[PDB]
Write a protein that binds this ligand. Structure first.
Ligand code: NJK
Ligand code: ZN
Length: 204
C-alpha cells in the first residue's frame, strides 16, 4: 500500500476545522445511545490527513464523469463515515463489494452529516456487539475511528424507509427525529480525507 498519514497538530486550523465539525454535528438520537453510547461531546485524540495517489486519482476521475452527467457539478460534500472496516478503507479504498445487502437503502456505502450518526455504525450495524474488549456500545474507554470523506453525491435520489443508483442518479439521500443519511454504490464516489481517532466522553 502507498497510503500515508499526516498527523495534524491540534493548533492546526485544518485540525480545529474537523475538530469543530465533529463536535458541533452531534445530536440526540431516537436510540437514546443504545447504538453509539450516551455522550454530548467527544475526546478528540488524533486527526490524520490520509494521502494516497492511486485513491485520489480514482476519486477525481469519477468526480469528473459525474459532473458531466449532472450539469457540470460534482455535488461534493464532506461527510462522516462509520464502519468496522476503516483500517482497510485507508489502504485499499472504499469498496462496494463489501456493502451490506439488507440495508434500508440496499447494498451501498452509508455516510452522514452528523458524526453522532456515523458513530453508531463503528462497531457494526446498530452498534453491533459494542467494543471488542468490553462488549459495550457505550464504552468511554475503547478508542473509536471515524472517516471524514470527500463524497461525490452527483444527482441524489430522495427515498424513505435496491443494488445500484436509480437510473440517471449517482447517490441516494434518505431521512428515516429525521436525520440525513447518504448512500453511494461505487467506492470511487468517496475519498477518506481525514482519519479521526477519538473516545465518546462520559457526561456529568
Ligand atoms: C441501518 C443500516 O445502516 C447501515 C449503515 C452503514 C452501512 C455501511 N456503510 N458502509 C459500510 C461498509 C461496507 C464498506 N466496506 C468497505 O469499503 C471496505 C473496503 C475494503 C475492505 N477490505 C476488507 C474487508 C472489508 C472491506 N470493506 C463500508 N457499511 C457497512 C457494511 C457492512 C457492515 C457494516 C457496515 F456499517 N451499512 C448499513
Ligand atoms: Zn471497551
Amino acid at each position: 500500500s502507498g497510503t500515508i498519514l499526516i498527523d495534524l497538530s491540534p493548533d492546526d486550523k485544518e485540525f480545529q476545522s474537523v475538530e469543530e465539525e465533529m463536535q458541533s454535528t452531534v445530536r440526540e438520537h431516537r436510540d437514546g445511545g443504545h447504538a453509539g453510547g450516551i455522550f454530548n461531546r467527544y475526546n478528540i485524540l488524533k486527526i490524520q490527513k490520509v494521502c494516497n495517489k492511486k485513491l485520489w486519482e480514482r476519486y477525481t476521475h469519477r468526480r469528473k464523469e459525474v459532473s458531466e452527467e449532472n450539469h457540470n457539478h460534482a455535488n461534493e460534500r464532506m461527510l462522516f463515515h462509520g464502519s468496522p472496516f476503516v483500517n482497510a478503507i485507508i489502504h485499499k479504498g472504499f469498496d462496494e463489494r463489501h456493502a451490506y445487502i439488507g440495508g434500508m437503502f440496499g447494498a451501498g456505502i452509508y455516510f452522514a452529516e452528523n458524526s453522532s450518526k456515523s458513530n453508531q455504525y463503528v462497531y457494526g450495524i446498530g452498534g453491533g456487539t459494542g467494543c471488542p474488549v468490553h462488549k459495550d456500545r457505550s464504552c468511554y474507554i475503547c478508542h473509536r475511528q471515524l472517516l471524514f470523506c470527500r463524497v461525490t453525491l452527483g444527482k441524489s435520489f430522495l427515498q424513505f424507509s435496491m443494488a445500484h443508483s436509480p437510473p440517471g442518479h449517482h447517490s441516494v439521500t434518505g431521512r428515516p427525529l429525521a436525520l440525513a443519511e447518504y448512500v453511494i454504490y461505487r467506492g470511487e464516489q468517496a475519498y477518506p480525507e481525514y482519519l479521526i481517532t477519538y473516545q465518546i466522553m462520559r457526561p456529568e
